[PDB]
Design an enzyme around this catalytic site. Structure first.
Site, PDB file in Angstrom:
ATOM      1  N   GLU A 196     -86.314  88.071  53.187  1.00  0.00           N
ATOM      2  CA  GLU A 196     -86.665  89.186  52.314  1.00  0.00           C
ATOM      3  C   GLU A 196     -86.352  90.514  53.002  1.00  0.00           C
ATOM      4  OE1 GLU A 196     -90.410  90.725  52.134  1.00  0.00           O
ATOM      5  OE2 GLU A 196     -89.458  92.280  50.921  1.00  0.00           O
ATOM      6  N   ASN A 209     -92.792  87.153  61.382  1.00  0.00           N
ATOM      7  CA  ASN A 209     -92.915  88.550  61.776  1.00  0.00           C
ATOM      8  C   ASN A 209     -94.306  88.870  62.293  1.00  0.00           C
ATOM      9  OD1 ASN A 209     -90.233  89.493  60.207  1.00  0.00           O
ATOM     10  ND2 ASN A 209     -91.472  88.186  58.871  1.00  0.00           N
ATOM     11  N   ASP A 217     -90.520  85.948  55.168  1.00  0.00           N
ATOM     12  CA  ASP A 217     -91.034  87.272  54.877  1.00  0.00           C
ATOM     13  C   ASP A 217     -90.360  88.310  55.764  1.00  0.00           C
ATOM     14  OD1 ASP A 217     -93.236  88.660  53.288  1.00  0.00           O
ATOM     15  OD2 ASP A 217     -93.711  89.329  55.321  1.00  0.00           O
ATOM     16  N   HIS A 235     -87.718  92.797  59.855  1.00  0.00           N
ATOM     17  CA  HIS A 235     -88.637  93.377  60.830  1.00  0.00           C
ATOM     18  C   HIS A 235     -88.781  92.633  62.154  1.00  0.00           C
ATOM     19  CE1 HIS A 235     -90.183  96.562  58.157  1.00  0.00           C
ATOM     20  NE2 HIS A 235     -89.835  95.705  57.215  1.00  0.00           N
TER      21      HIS A 235
END
Length: 570
Positions: free
Chosen positions: A338, A151, A293, A297
């Protein structure tokens, strides 16, 4: 298909029964005291470690691949029955620190703030130690989950912006490099605005979307938002780009630059590079999976390529290294996202995203584990997850961002059983086994905050040997029994507390296991296991290796000191 979680590997691992020891590498053993020196992090102007360097709750305490290695060599994890280690990302982090806002230096000890996907962080160690680590891990059969970020970049920090001359360091920035505490001023020395060219030397606008000058921000939330103000990779973007200006610079301070270009080539998509560089770790050392992670996004399409790249790369690596530790593994490169506050339920991450797994937040704080509910929680998860292939979760009850669950000895004992018995993967966050406390200091900051309260140093001095026994006994039990994550839940009838069974029957896995949680102590539990076991079956209560044959569906184990019964088929 070999989609991660669609067979059992030769050693009995499967991502459906992931028992992920998430450890911040800095906080585990500083197994090589020379590493603390790396990039001039912890040192003063004389090169002497700063007084508090090992106590300040955001500085590198110095935990390193070598001391992780020593932890593996010690078999710490092996005593816990951990089967995946989620390390803080091993690639070269941001060298310096950002303002924690809680006043201390936030040195990237957690390994999210990437600097270069091609190099290791010299505080964690050399590639050889990393190679050694992953070899050590693979030697132990522990899957190294690499905790990558696709990300966002790391934050810029004084030490990097010095060393690589990118961005603008204002006067006195450098002195902050020699400070542990009262460093919230630090960003006041870093100039995120004045020149596109100084920041031009950092990644590129073709590489970053951010508030940096140029670098145009992404269009909106989720797939295009700079989470936490972290600059976000334009992995959305099909445009061909070069190697980033910072890495023109870095690799030319080193010599390997020309070797790298001859390996990557000058033109790729950001995803294709990040695929290339990240999958190089897969291509080079054979890293087994990524915890992505913030998967929420960036574009699932871009997450899709990355897996296929890392799928392609691990195939290559597994072709190169034949007979190396882990060259023969077969599950494709596992990828878990996540998604914050993900429940249990099949969604496009498993299709658009190609994710094998999502982190399941519903177990946080053990509320789903209260004996008034946990009976149904294990039903609701096993039905959903263990029936749909390419569908899985990673349940956790403490994390680097959420909570760090503490209470009476019995509650730690109880939640230790009620937690790890969950279907799907589980995240053992480090020191939950040991009753690792919050750090004495600035007030709690979990629930998706910086979680520094949760990331105290590993209390090696003071391990709660009794609670350790609990997490060891339950964790070893879970590790042996793939059905605990992968199996269909059957609710069972017991004299006290809560009981259940699980069956798993795929891919020849052919496994079933049961437990009782919170049974009244030192007493015959009389739990109806007739749905798993015919009445001549022997459970072994792996909590103490006591044996009790089923009788009329019931088994009559002594519940022992902690009232927890871990009932495998003999």
């Amino acid at each position: 298909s070999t989609a991660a979680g669609s067979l059992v590997e030769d050693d009995g691992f499967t991502w459906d029964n992931a028992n992920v020891y998430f450890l911040l590498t800095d906080r585990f053993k500083n197994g090589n005291t020379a590493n603390d020196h790396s990039y001039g992090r912890t040192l003063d102007k004389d090169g002497k470690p700063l007084e508090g360097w090992d106590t300040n709750p955001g500085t590198f305490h110095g935990g390193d691949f070598a001391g992780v290695t020593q932890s593996i060599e010690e078999g710490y994890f092996d005593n816990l029955g951990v089967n995946a280690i989620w390390i803080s990302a091993p690639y070269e982090q941001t060298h310096g620190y950002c303002d924690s806002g809680k006043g201390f230096a936030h040195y990237s000890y957690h390994g999210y703030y990437v600097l270069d996907y091609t190099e290791t962080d010299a505080n964690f160690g050399t590639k050889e130690e990393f190679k050694t680590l992953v070899d050590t891990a693979h030697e132990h059969g522990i899957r190294v989950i690499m905790d990558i970020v696709m990300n966002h970049t790391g934050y810029n920090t004084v030490a990097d912006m010095e060393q690589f001359g990118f961005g603008t360091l204002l006067d006195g920035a450098l002195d902050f490099k020699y400070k542990l505490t009262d460093v919230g001023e630090v960003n006041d020395h870093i100039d995120y605005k004045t020149s596109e060219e100084d920041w031009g030397k950092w990644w590129s606008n073709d590489w970053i979307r951010s508030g940096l000058p140029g670098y145009t921000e992404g269009a909106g939330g989720d797939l295009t938002m700079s989470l936490s103000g972290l600059p976000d990779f334009r992995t959305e973007q099909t445009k061909d780009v070069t190697i980033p200006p910072i890495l023109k610079t870095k690799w030319t301070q080193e010599g390997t630059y020309a070797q790298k270009l001859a390996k990557y080539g000058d033109k790729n998509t950001v995803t294709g590079y990040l695929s290339t560089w990240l999958s190089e770790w897969v291509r080079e050392y054979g890293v087994d999976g990524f915890r992505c992670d913030t998967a929420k996004h960036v574009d699932k399409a871009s997450w899709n390529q990355l897996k296929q790249a890392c799928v392609s790369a691990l195939r290559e690596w597994r072709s190169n290294n034949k007979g190396k530790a882990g060259a023969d593994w077969k599950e494709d490169f596992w990828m878990t996202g996540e998604h914050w506050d993900h429940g249990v339920g099949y969604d496009t991450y498993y299709s658009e995203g190609g994710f094998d797994s999502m982190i399941n937040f519903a177990v946080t704080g053990g509320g789903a584990l209260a004996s008034g509910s946990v009976a149904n929680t294990y039903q609701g998860y096993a039905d959903k997850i263990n029936t749909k292939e390419g569908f899985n979760v990673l349940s956790f009850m403490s994390s680097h961002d959420e909570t760090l669950t503490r209470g009476d000895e019995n509650t730690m004992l109880y939640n230790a059983a009620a937690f790890l018995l969950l279907p799907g993967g589980v995240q053992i966050f480090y020191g939950d086994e040991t009753n690792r406390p919050l750090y004495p200091g600035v007030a709690f900051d979990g629930y998706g905050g910086s979680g520094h309260a949760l990331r105290s140093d590993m209390n090696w001095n003071d391990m709660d040997k009794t609670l350790l026994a609990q997490w060891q006994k339950v964790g070893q039990f879970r590790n042996k029994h793939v059905s605990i994550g992968a199996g269909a839940n059957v609710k069972l009838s017991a004299t006290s507390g809560v009981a259940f069974g699980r069956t798993y029957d795929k891919n020849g896995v052919t496994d079933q296991a049961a437990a009782v949680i919170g049974c009244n102590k030192n007493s015959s539990v009389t739990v109806d296991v007739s749905t798993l076991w015919e009445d001549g079956s022997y459970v072994i209560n792996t909590y103490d290796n006591s044996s009790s044959v089923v009788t009329d569906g019931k088994v009559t184990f002594n519940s022992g000191v902690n009232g927890t019964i871990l009932m495998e088929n003999a």
